[PDB]
Amino acid sequence: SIKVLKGLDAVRKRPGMYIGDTDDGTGLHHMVFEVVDNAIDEALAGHCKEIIVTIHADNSVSVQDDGRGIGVSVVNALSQKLELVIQREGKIHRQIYEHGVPQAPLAVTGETEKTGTMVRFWPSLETFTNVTEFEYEILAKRLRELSFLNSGVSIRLRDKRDGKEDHFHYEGGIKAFVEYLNKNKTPIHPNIFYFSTEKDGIGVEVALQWNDGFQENIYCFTNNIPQRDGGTHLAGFRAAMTRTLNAYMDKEGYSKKAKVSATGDDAREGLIAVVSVKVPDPKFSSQTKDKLVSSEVKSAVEQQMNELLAEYLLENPTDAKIVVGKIIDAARAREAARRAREMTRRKGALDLAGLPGKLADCQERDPALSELYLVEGDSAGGSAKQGRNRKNQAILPLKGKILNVEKARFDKMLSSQEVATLITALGCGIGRDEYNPDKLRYHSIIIMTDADVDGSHIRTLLLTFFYRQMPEIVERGHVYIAQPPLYKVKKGKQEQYIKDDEAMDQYQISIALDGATLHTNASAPALAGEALEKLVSEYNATQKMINRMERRYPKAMLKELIYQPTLTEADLSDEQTVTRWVNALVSELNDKEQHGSQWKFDVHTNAEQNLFEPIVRVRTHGVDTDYPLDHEFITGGEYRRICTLGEKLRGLLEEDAFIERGERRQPVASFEQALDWLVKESRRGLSIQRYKGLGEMNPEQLWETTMDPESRRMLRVTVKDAIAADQLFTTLMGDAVEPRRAFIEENALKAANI
Amino acid sequence: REITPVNIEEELKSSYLDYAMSVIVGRALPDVRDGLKPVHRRVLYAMNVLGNDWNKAYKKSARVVGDVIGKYHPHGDSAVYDTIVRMAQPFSLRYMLVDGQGNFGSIDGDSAAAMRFTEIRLAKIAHELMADLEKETVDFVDNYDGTEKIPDVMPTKIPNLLVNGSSGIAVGMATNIPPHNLTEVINGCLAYIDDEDISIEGLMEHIPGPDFPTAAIINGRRGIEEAYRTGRGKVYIRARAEVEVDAKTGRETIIVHEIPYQVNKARLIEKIAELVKEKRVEGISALRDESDKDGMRIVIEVKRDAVGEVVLNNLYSQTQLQVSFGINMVALHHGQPKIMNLKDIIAAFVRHRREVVTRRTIFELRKARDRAHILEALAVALANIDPIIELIRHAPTPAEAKTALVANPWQLGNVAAMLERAGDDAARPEWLEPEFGVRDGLYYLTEQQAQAILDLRLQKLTGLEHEKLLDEYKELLDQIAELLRILGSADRLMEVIREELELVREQFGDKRRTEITAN
DNA sequence: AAAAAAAAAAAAAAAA
DNA sequence: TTTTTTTTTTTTTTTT
């Protein structure tokens, strides 16, 4: 009994950590959606059929249920009252709470049997501020979305203060969702594609309808949780739609009549779609759940769409004709948007056209429908040539690092590497007299170097060549940069490609917070995932700052300053307060010292500012040094970050605090121990595969990542300012070393500083 | 989006800064403490892990290169082998860190044999370059895959940066440090320990100048003084040449006994031939190389109508018998490049040894306290062996036996009473809570101690093993006292450091090769 | 005098 | 068996 009150007080001390931002009124709606989510979780088991939510005039929200009838709960701790009535086992029982404190035996009898629990919770005005009432629009929108996703589930809503009403009951479900989305717009064909097939436990539901708006709007959900950034379901949906429509145009010969090849963003143009998925164990990129990264979901959506969209197109010739006409019109507009050009001879088996032996050329004779991939070597060349599209994509493998044309003379450009590059592009860049960029053979030149340091250097050298020798090609936007991944990381079924080490760090944090629950008290609910994620992000930011500050001060002292009370400027005036503060700091440092360091304090009385600043002596490795915490440090901004994190982490862990990762459990005494345990448990089944260039990637892996136009992630090189680009190229790549050294040292100091 | 525009300025800046910082931190410059680049550090760590001890049999160079590339170094073979080749050959390094078998090249310009032919083994000095690595004396950084760990820096005992020198090129910076004599460098370190406010004049008295592996002559000393004060200076290295005069006839021959540093003998002979053919240098009748594997001997026969001294001076001025060695002492200090003079390098090395010895003593003290805890458990168990075997027999499983042993407090025997109270405090591990241990003549075992008692074999019940445990406990108490004495006094730390440096000077002492002259 | 060009030391990228 | 680049100091050619 006493344990319950401790949990209620733990929740009520930091209500923002559990329910969310209480200032702007998100917490109240989160409480309402918590109760309604409990009701809908009851309803998913084929028991409930009606959820009458209400908004009384007394600023109270009832969530009635007609279902089956049913620690410390977050919802009843914040609210100042409950009215719990459960009409179970033939007798009505009633319970009353007040700030989570029950006042009843929790057992009453009444007439009529019925089923379901109705819970009227009264939000406390103390915890929440600036938003007392409930916005009808937010609840109406979310409840209608839940009604669409959970088909065959009545969800009433009755605003009693106004007398409004709603009755969301759509047996169609996703088709009703698409109709609701398209009711304001003009759909271009009458029928709506739809399936709800389930396979391997991944229930998949999709719908489609095109309109005249030429706007893309694809919504995706996973267990009734929207994904702002899409995910694997979105990728599989796009891939299957593009494949099916391209195959349909190829079979029926629509494209040959128009003499234009449709691509992605033409099929998706003017599209409305909803993609609802139900994974039993979903995996997300973060605790916000804005992106699904579950590897098993792409294949299921791809297979089901590939079958059923083609099956729909076969049985609906008129709607297929209308959609294909729209896609042809979009492709014609895209073709008309292009610059004038001429056909070019391509290297082939019958005719080599006087092109290099290492060029694996494509079949498309038209530039603006062809690509050139400039790769780093012959092994990367083989890996790229094995996996590509022979129609569009050509490869020209280089040989390691190329000449620095900034340092090299014009006549020094007689190397086999640069001549081979000039022959394939056919700009005739040598001489600066025959240089005609209109005869460029590819209007997409892709610098697909390796994903490492020397790959970056070779990319810089190629950019120097293209900016200095072929400046108009860069201006017209023909130069692109691929972004192949450096790491592949696997945990059993899960797989992900990671580009940078910063992305690796973010992914490691994401696994560490995956399925992790942190309990500040033994009898208390776990923290919210987003709150713990924000705590860990701020903690890592401060740790990076402290590592940057490692030379000026010891890391142990700065880490201990997080948990100590703050020291304002007014504290510096008093001799006694600074002495007590620094004495407590040094005693805490001495107590937790695992090495030979010995901490001592002193106070230097400044006669100018009339202050008493503290000093922290330390004797590490036999070397004695003093670290005065001057007036600059107290208001230096670094100490402000330390103090903010300290204010967040003063009392988030009582004596009996612990963390869990599902089955596993661990008591903790500090946030460091919890973070270390979570990271250690995260890296158990982990396996990182670093790619030392594209020769280690399989052709299928290289195709899936950064050759497929569906899953490509490119960058157009552009020149914002000519003068700044010229100055930067001359400084970084010229002959003189002193400006280069100054630039490197300045950027090092900038990185060390803010 | 599939396609997102990026400015050419931002892309170039980010890519080139990533490359420059990567080269500067990792590959180009050395670390001031251990004087090794990451490739050298990873090669030595891989050889130590394989067990390429100086007294063990050789191993093929291909195995070492494959081990380094597969585990630690992600930057491709045929450069790791070049590093091993340079470390294995005596004309490059003043003190070789690798003991090689086969053809590793020569000053004549012959290239080393391929990776499949040579064999590789650590030098004896490389073991002192990696002393007490297992006692957590240095921080271990993760592998590129995260599957293993590599030392961040080696716990060296030799000042490798000053001793073997270095030479490398970064994007902005470029280091060029000459090698020195180990005895003189250790004497400078000892003088610094004696007086840390020692002047560079005193460090120059102890360290007159560099000592190249190829014995030679250094003309000036202003360059050495400028290098050791500012970190930069120009030194002129001369060849040992004598105009030997024939007694019978007046004809003379110029015999070059020794050659400057990083000078190829074949290219020198070729350049002298080019100068003679073009008639830029007169007086030379013939040119030969008579190196009989007993040093070297480049014979240059002077004509009758030539003084010979003038010919030798002209060869010094024009040919590569004089080379300017530009000292540029750039090294990583606290993970950033910095131009460092002699006293900075010596101070950094002494700080490194301070840290290494302190961490080693902490590790040894923790180990000794843990073993003393276990030995207390074993002694108390053998004092009360009969009720313990009876309890273990009565219990059904080892877990219930452990719980029973932890629950029951145990009487101290006479031998255990005399043993434990003689130790007194300063033997319990720090992590141990005050509930456990001796409390009013009754031991309170932990879970770990009960597990150790369950793991006790019947061999330990013999009479000799109890005396062995008593003796080991006394030895561990004495070791704990000595370790606490080292960790308490700052002067004893320097006593240990000075003794180690003197032993290193004694074991690997060597004589000067190059001569510093006045001109 | 001047100014540019070439070669050479050691870690890296590439192949033939 | 063999060869091409990046990168920074320092010298030697050679050419004016």
PDB file of C-alpha atoms in Angstrom, chain B residues 273-491:
ATOM      1  CA  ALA B 273      79.453   9.181 -63.260  1.00  0.00           C
ATOM      2  CA  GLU B 274      77.042  11.719 -64.779  1.00  0.00           C
ATOM      3  CA  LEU B 275      79.126  14.646 -63.516  1.00  0.00           C
ATOM      4  CA  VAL B 276      82.326  13.078 -64.864  1.00  0.00           C
ATOM      5  CA  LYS B 277      80.730  12.358 -68.256  1.00  0.00           C
ATOM      6  CA  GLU B 278      79.362  15.906 -68.529  1.00  0.00           C
ATOM      7  CA  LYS B 279      82.743  17.231 -67.242  1.00  0.00           C
ATOM      8  CA  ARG B 280      81.051  19.271 -64.517  1.00  0.00           C
ATOM      9  CA  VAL B 281      83.558  17.781 -62.030  1.00  0.00           C
ATOM     10  CA  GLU B 282      87.168  17.416 -63.198  1.00  0.00           C
ATOM     11  CA  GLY B 283      90.055  15.390 -61.807  1.00  0.00           C
ATOM     12  CA  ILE B 284      88.342  11.971 -61.562  1.00  0.00           C
ATOM     13  CA  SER B 285      90.116   9.187 -63.470  1.00  0.00           C
ATOM     14  CA  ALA B 286      88.041   6.184 -62.356  1.00  0.00           C
ATOM     15  CA  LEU B 287      85.149   5.273 -60.074  1.00  0.00           C
ATOM     16  CA  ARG B 288      84.517   1.983 -58.271  1.00  0.00           C
ATOM     17  CA  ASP B 289      82.544   0.431 -55.414  1.00  0.00           C
ATOM     18  CA  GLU B 290      84.651  -2.017 -53.372  1.00  0.00           C
ATOM     19  CA  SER B 291      82.297  -2.671 -50.447  1.00  0.00           C
ATOM     20  CA  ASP B 292      83.512  -6.073 -49.202  1.00  0.00           C
ATOM     21  CA  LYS B 293      80.737  -6.528 -46.583  1.00  0.00           C
ATOM     22  CA  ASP B 294      83.138  -4.911 -44.079  1.00  0.00           C
ATOM     23  CA  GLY B 295      81.694  -1.409 -44.247  1.00  0.00           C
ATOM     24  CA  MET B 296      81.801   0.381 -47.596  1.00  0.00           C
ATOM     25  CA  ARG B 297      84.579   1.656 -49.835  1.00  0.00           C
ATOM     26  CA  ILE B 298      83.878   3.917 -52.825  1.00  0.00           C
ATOM     27  CA  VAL B 299      87.225   4.393 -54.579  1.00  0.00           C
ATOM     28  CA  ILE B 300      87.662   7.505 -56.749  1.00  0.00           C
ATOM     29  CA  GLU B 301      91.050   7.680 -58.464  1.00  0.00           C
ATOM     30  CA  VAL B 302      92.406  11.211 -58.875  1.00  0.00           C
ATOM     31  CA  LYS B 303      94.430  12.124 -61.952  1.00  0.00           C
ATOM     32  CA  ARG B 304      98.083  13.137 -61.733  1.00  0.00           C
ATOM     33  CA  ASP B 305      97.312  16.779 -62.641  1.00  0.00           C
ATOM     34  CA  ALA B 306      94.798  17.239 -59.822  1.00  0.00           C
ATOM     35  CA  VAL B 307      95.350  18.135 -56.178  1.00  0.00           C
ATOM     36  CA  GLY B 308      92.725  15.694 -54.836  1.00  0.00           C
ATOM     37  CA  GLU B 309      91.643  17.896 -51.943  1.00  0.00           C
ATOM     38  CA  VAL B 310      89.989  20.230 -54.456  1.00  0.00           C
ATOM     39  CA  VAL B 311      88.345  17.222 -56.126  1.00  0.00           C
ATOM     40  CA  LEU B 312      86.954  16.048 -52.785  1.00  0.00           C
ATOM     41  CA  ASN B 313      85.670  19.543 -51.960  1.00  0.00           C
ATOM     42  CA  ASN B 314      83.974  19.752 -55.365  1.00  0.00           C
ATOM     43  CA  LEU B 315      82.393  16.345 -54.750  1.00  0.00           C
ATOM     44  CA  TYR B 316      81.131  17.605 -51.382  1.00  0.00           C
ATOM     45  CA  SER B 317      79.633  20.754 -52.894  1.00  0.00           C
ATOM     46  CA  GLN B 318      77.981  19.203 -55.974  1.00  0.00           C
ATOM     47  CA  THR B 319      77.282  15.530 -55.251  1.00  0.00           C
ATOM     48  CA  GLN B 320      75.149  14.033 -52.471  1.00  0.00           C
ATOM     49  CA  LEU B 321      78.137  13.622 -50.130  1.00  0.00           C
ATOM     50  CA  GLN B 322      76.629  16.668 -48.378  1.00  0.00           C
ATOM     51  CA  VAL B 323      72.904  16.560 -47.583  1.00  0.00           C
ATOM     52  CA  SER B 324      70.865  19.195 -45.770  1.00  0.00           C
ATOM     53  CA  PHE B 325      68.663  17.542 -43.130  1.00  0.00           C
ATOM     54  CA  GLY B 326      65.793  19.890 -42.341  1.00  0.00           C
ATOM     55  CA  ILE B 327      64.640  19.202 -38.791  1.00  0.00           C
ATOM     56  CA  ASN B 328      60.907  19.799 -38.279  1.00  0.00           C
ATOM     57  CA  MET B 329      59.744  18.302 -34.978  1.00  0.00           C
ATOM     58  CA  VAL B 330      55.970  18.070 -35.444  1.00  0.00           C
ATOM     59  CA  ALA B 331      54.141  15.399 -33.447  1.00  0.00           C
ATOM     60  CA  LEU B 332      50.708  14.722 -31.988  1.00  0.00           C
ATOM     61  CA  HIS B 333      50.353  16.066 -28.435  1.00  0.00           C
ATOM     62  CA  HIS B 334      46.943  15.593 -26.789  1.00  0.00           C
ATOM     63  CA  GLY B 335      45.605  14.492 -30.170  1.00  0.00           C
ATOM     64  CA  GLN B 336      46.588  17.636 -32.091  1.00  0.00           C
ATOM     65  CA  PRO B 337      49.689  18.573 -34.118  1.00  0.00           C
ATOM     66  CA  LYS B 338      52.281  20.751 -32.427  1.00  0.00           C
ATOM     67  CA  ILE B 339      55.850  21.895 -33.041  1.00  0.00           C
ATOM     68  CA  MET B 340      57.828  20.593 -30.053  1.00  0.00           C
ATOM     69  CA  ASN B 341      61.391  21.177 -28.867  1.00  0.00           C
ATOM     70  CA  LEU B 342      63.658  18.803 -26.923  1.00  0.00           C
ATOM     71  CA  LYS B 343      62.465  19.624 -23.402  1.00  0.00           C
ATOM     72  CA  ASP B 344      58.811  19.291 -24.434  1.00  0.00           C
ATOM     73  CA  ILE B 345      59.446  15.777 -25.765  1.00  0.00           C
ATOM     74  CA  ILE B 346      61.370  14.728 -22.645  1.00  0.00           C
ATOM     75  CA  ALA B 347      58.658  16.150 -20.368  1.00  0.00           C
ATOM     76  CA  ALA B 348      55.956  14.354 -22.365  1.00  0.00           C
ATOM     77  CA  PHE B 349      57.834  11.056 -22.062  1.00  0.00           C
ATOM     78  CA  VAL B 350      58.293  11.471 -18.304  1.00  0.00           C
ATOM     79  CA  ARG B 351      54.584  12.278 -17.916  1.00  0.00           C
ATOM     80  CA  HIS B 352      53.780   9.137 -19.908  1.00  0.00           C
ATOM     81  CA  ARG B 353      55.960   7.006 -17.634  1.00  0.00           C
ATOM     82  CA  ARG B 354      54.312   8.582 -14.572  1.00  0.00           C
ATOM     83  CA  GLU B 355      50.870   7.629 -15.892  1.00  0.00           C
ATOM     84  CA  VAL B 356      51.983   4.116 -16.883  1.00  0.00           C
ATOM     85  CA  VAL B 357      53.575   3.317 -13.518  1.00  0.00           C
ATOM     86  CA  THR B 358      50.612   4.706 -11.563  1.00  0.00           C
ATOM     87  CA  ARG B 359      48.075   2.689 -13.572  1.00  0.00           C
ATOM     88  CA  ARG B 360      50.249  -0.427 -13.255  1.00  0.00           C
ATOM     89  CA  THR B 361      50.445  -0.043  -9.475  1.00  0.00           C
ATOM     90  CA  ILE B 362      46.668   0.456  -9.252  1.00  0.00           C
ATOM     91  CA  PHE B 363      46.072  -2.726 -11.272  1.00  0.00           C
ATOM     92  CA  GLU B 364      48.558  -4.749  -9.215  1.00  0.00           C
ATOM     93  CA  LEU B 365      47.081  -3.521  -5.926  1.00  0.00           C
ATOM     94  CA  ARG B 366      43.556  -4.458  -7.034  1.00  0.00           C
ATOM     95  CA  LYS B 367      44.750  -7.915  -8.126  1.00  0.00           C
ATOM     96  CA  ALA B 368      46.615  -8.509  -4.856  1.00  0.00           C
ATOM     97  CA  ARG B 369      43.637  -7.446  -2.735  1.00  0.00           C
ATOM     98  CA  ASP B 370      41.297  -9.753  -4.673  1.00  0.00           C
ATOM     99  CA  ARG B 371      43.657 -12.702  -4.253  1.00  0.00           C
ATOM    100  CA  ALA B 372      44.032 -11.923  -0.539  1.00  0.00           C
ATOM    101  CA  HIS B 373      40.228 -12.020  -0.248  1.00  0.00           C
ATOM    102  CA  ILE B 374      40.132 -15.442  -1.925  1.00  0.00           C
ATOM    103  CA  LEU B 375      42.982 -16.757   0.237  1.00  0.00           C
ATOM    104  CA  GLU B 376      41.151 -15.601   3.370  1.00  0.00           C
ATOM    105  CA  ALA B 377      38.167 -17.636   2.161  1.00  0.00           C
ATOM    106  CA  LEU B 378      40.306 -20.731   1.563  1.00  0.00           C
ATOM    107  CA  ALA B 379      42.104 -20.453   4.916  1.00  0.00           C
ATOM    108  CA  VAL B 380      38.845 -20.077   6.848  1.00  0.00           C
ATOM    109  CA  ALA B 381      37.393 -23.015   4.905  1.00  0.00           C
ATOM    110  CA  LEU B 382      40.309 -25.338   5.657  1.00  0.00           C
ATOM    111  CA  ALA B 383      40.111 -24.237   9.300  1.00  0.00           C
ATOM    112  CA  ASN B 384      36.483 -25.494   9.427  1.00  0.00           C
ATOM    113  CA  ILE B 385      36.658 -28.302   6.872  1.00  0.00           C
ATOM    114  CA  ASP B 386      34.557 -30.892   8.748  1.00  0.00           C
ATOM    115  CA  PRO B 387      31.301 -28.877   9.138  1.00  0.00           C
ATOM    116  CA  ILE B 388      31.734 -27.583   5.581  1.00  0.00           C
ATOM    117  CA  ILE B 389      31.886 -31.072   4.057  1.00  0.00           C
ATOM    118  CA  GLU B 390      28.967 -32.107   6.276  1.00  0.00           C
ATOM    119  CA  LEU B 391      26.914 -29.117   5.077  1.00  0.00           C
ATOM    120  CA  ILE B 392      27.801 -29.773   1.432  1.00  0.00           C
ATOM    121  CA  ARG B 393      26.809 -33.429   1.824  1.00  0.00           C
ATOM    122  CA  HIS B 394      23.497 -32.500   3.450  1.00  0.00           C
ATOM    123  CA  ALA B 395      22.561 -29.913   0.813  1.00  0.00           C
ATOM    124  CA  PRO B 396      20.931 -31.132  -2.453  1.00  0.00           C
ATOM    125  CA  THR B 397      22.497 -28.698  -4.956  1.00  0.00           C
ATOM    126  CA  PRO B 398      25.510 -26.346  -5.039  1.00  0.00           C
ATOM    127  CA  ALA B 399      23.289 -23.239  -4.952  1.00  0.00           C
ATOM    128  CA  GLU B 400      21.736 -24.260  -1.638  1.00  0.00           C
ATOM    129  CA  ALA B 401      25.237 -25.063  -0.367  1.00  0.00           C
ATOM    130  CA  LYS B 402      26.365 -21.543  -1.309  1.00  0.00           C
ATOM    131  CA  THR B 403      23.375 -19.989   0.453  1.00  0.00           C
ATOM    132  CA  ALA B 404      24.023 -22.086   3.573  1.00  0.00           C
ATOM    133  CA  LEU B 405      27.722 -21.156   3.610  1.00  0.00           C
ATOM    134  CA  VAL B 406      26.905 -17.459   3.219  1.00  0.00           C
ATOM    135  CA  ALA B 407      24.202 -17.651   5.902  1.00  0.00           C
ATOM    136  CA  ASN B 408      26.362 -19.370   8.522  1.00  0.00           C
ATOM    137  CA  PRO B 409      29.070 -17.196  10.114  1.00  0.00           C
ATOM    138  CA  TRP B 410      32.273 -19.190  10.521  1.00  0.00           C
ATOM    139  CA  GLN B 411      34.596 -19.365  13.506  1.00  0.00           C
ATOM    140  CA  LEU B 412      38.181 -18.294  12.909  1.00  0.00           C
ATOM    141  CA  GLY B 413      40.647 -21.063  13.646  1.00  0.00           C
ATOM    142  CA  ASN B 414      43.857 -20.480  15.557  1.00  0.00           C
ATOM    143  CA  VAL B 415      45.872 -20.464  12.324  1.00  0.00           C
ATOM    144  CA  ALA B 416      43.276 -18.229  10.655  1.00  0.00           C
ATOM    145  CA  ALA B 417      43.094 -15.996  13.738  1.00  0.00           C
ATOM    146  CA  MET B 418      46.857 -15.446  13.734  1.00  0.00           C
ATOM    147  CA  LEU B 419      46.959 -15.072   9.935  1.00  0.00           C
ATOM    148  CA  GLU B 420      44.142 -12.554   9.499  1.00  0.00           C
ATOM    149  CA  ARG B 421      44.795 -10.269  12.474  1.00  0.00           C
ATOM    150  CA  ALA B 422      48.454  -9.963  11.461  1.00  0.00           C
ATOM    151  CA  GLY B 423      47.271  -8.548   8.139  1.00  0.00           C
ATOM    152  CA  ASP B 424      44.951  -6.027   9.856  1.00  0.00           C
ATOM    153  CA  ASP B 425      43.477  -3.417   7.447  1.00  0.00           C
ATOM    154  CA  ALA B 426      44.846  -2.430   4.008  1.00  0.00           C
ATOM    155  CA  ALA B 427      44.023  -5.875   2.565  1.00  0.00           C
ATOM    156  CA  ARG B 428      40.252  -5.824   1.973  1.00  0.00           C
ATOM    157  CA  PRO B 429      39.260  -4.812  -1.584  1.00  0.00           C
ATOM    158  CA  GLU B 430      37.696  -1.371  -1.835  1.00  0.00           C
ATOM    159  CA  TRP B 431      34.428  -2.603  -3.374  1.00  0.00           C
ATOM    160  CA  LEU B 432      33.815  -4.994  -0.453  1.00  0.00           C
ATOM    161  CA  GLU B 433      30.992  -3.854   1.806  1.00  0.00           C
ATOM    162  CA  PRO B 434      31.656  -3.576   5.572  1.00  0.00           C
ATOM    163  CA  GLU B 435      29.072  -6.282   6.370  1.00  0.00           C
ATOM    164  CA  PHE B 436      31.395  -9.057   5.179  1.00  0.00           C
ATOM    165  CA  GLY B 437      34.820 -10.024   6.481  1.00  0.00           C
ATOM    166  CA  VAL B 438      35.915 -10.583  10.055  1.00  0.00           C
ATOM    167  CA  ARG B 439      33.437  -9.243  12.629  1.00  0.00           C
ATOM    168  CA  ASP B 440      34.017 -10.126  16.305  1.00  0.00           C
ATOM    169  CA  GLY B 441      35.975 -13.306  15.630  1.00  0.00           C
ATOM    170  CA  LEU B 442      33.491 -14.690  13.088  1.00  0.00           C
ATOM    171  CA  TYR B 443      34.073 -14.632   9.344  1.00  0.00           C
ATOM    172  CA  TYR B 444      31.252 -13.614   6.979  1.00  0.00           C
ATOM    173  CA  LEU B 445      31.835 -15.088   3.531  1.00  0.00           C
ATOM    174  CA  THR B 446      30.540 -13.488   0.339  1.00  0.00           C
ATOM    175  CA  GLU B 447      28.895 -15.263  -2.586  1.00  0.00           C
ATOM    176  CA  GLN B 448      32.211 -15.200  -4.464  1.00  0.00           C
ATOM    177  CA  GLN B 449      34.062 -16.701  -1.499  1.00  0.00           C
ATOM    178  CA  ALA B 450      31.435 -19.432  -1.097  1.00  0.00           C
ATOM    179  CA  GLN B 451      31.765 -20.202  -4.813  1.00  0.00           C
ATOM    180  CA  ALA B 452      35.547 -20.387  -4.423  1.00  0.00           C
ATOM    181  CA  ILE B 453      35.150 -22.759  -1.471  1.00  0.00           C
ATOM    182  CA  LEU B 454      32.829 -24.960  -3.535  1.00  0.00           C
ATOM    183  CA  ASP B 455      35.423 -24.963  -6.331  1.00  0.00           C
ATOM    184  CA  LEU B 456      38.011 -26.133  -3.762  1.00  0.00           C
ATOM    185  CA  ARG B 457      39.436 -29.522  -4.737  1.00  0.00           C
ATOM    186  CA  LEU B 458      40.305 -32.400  -2.425  1.00  0.00           C
ATOM    187  CA  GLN B 459      43.998 -31.920  -3.285  1.00  0.00           C
ATOM    188  CA  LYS B 460      44.068 -28.784  -1.113  1.00  0.00           C
ATOM    189  CA  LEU B 461      43.245 -30.745   2.065  1.00  0.00           C
ATOM    190  CA  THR B 462      46.842 -32.032   2.149  1.00  0.00           C
ATOM    191  CA  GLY B 463      49.090 -30.629   4.856  1.00  0.00           C
ATOM    192  CA  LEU B 464      51.450 -28.783   2.518  1.00  0.00           C
ATOM    193  CA  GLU B 465      48.786 -26.685   0.784  1.00  0.00           C
ATOM    194  CA  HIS B 466      47.634 -24.943   3.975  1.00  0.00           C
ATOM    195  CA  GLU B 467      51.201 -23.759   4.584  1.00  0.00           C
ATOM    196  CA  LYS B 468      51.358 -22.717   0.921  1.00  0.00           C
ATOM    197  CA  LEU B 469      48.227 -20.591   1.380  1.00  0.00           C
ATOM    198  CA  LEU B 470      49.675 -19.016   4.541  1.00  0.00           C
ATOM    199  CA  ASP B 471      52.948 -18.162   2.786  1.00  0.00           C
ATOM    200  CA  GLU B 472      51.144 -16.734  -0.246  1.00  0.00           C
ATOM    201  CA  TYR B 473      48.973 -14.578   2.024  1.00  0.00           C
ATOM    202  CA  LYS B 474      52.055 -13.180   3.781  1.00  0.00           C
ATOM    203  CA  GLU B 475      53.717 -12.481   0.420  1.00  0.00           C
ATOM    204  CA  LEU B 476      50.602 -10.694  -0.833  1.00  0.00           C
ATOM    205  CA  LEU B 477      50.474  -8.559   2.318  1.00  0.00           C
ATOM    206  CA  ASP B 478      54.091  -7.498   1.744  1.00  0.00           C
ATOM    207  CA  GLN B 479      53.353  -6.758  -1.926  1.00  0.00           C
ATOM    208  CA  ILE B 480      50.301  -4.696  -0.936  1.00  0.00           C
ATOM    209  CA  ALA B 481      52.452  -2.715   1.501  1.00  0.00           C
ATOM    210  CA  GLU B 482      55.030  -1.976  -1.209  1.00  0.00           C
ATOM    211  CA  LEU B 483      52.348  -0.983  -3.735  1.00  0.00           C
ATOM    212  CA  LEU B 484      50.710   1.350  -1.213  1.00  0.00           C
ATOM    213  CA  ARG B 485      54.128   2.857  -0.498  1.00  0.00           C
ATOM    214  CA  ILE B 486      54.607   3.546  -4.213  1.00  0.00           C
ATOM    215  CA  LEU B 487      51.120   5.040  -4.573  1.00  0.00           C
ATOM    216  CA  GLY B 488      51.474   7.202  -1.447  1.00  0.00           C
ATOM    217  CA  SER B 489      54.776   9.028  -1.974  1.00  0.00           C
ATOM    218  CA  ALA B 490      55.488  11.035  -5.119  1.00  0.00           C
ATOM    219  CA  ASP B 491      59.247  10.536  -4.685  1.00  0.00           C
TER     220      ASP B 491
END
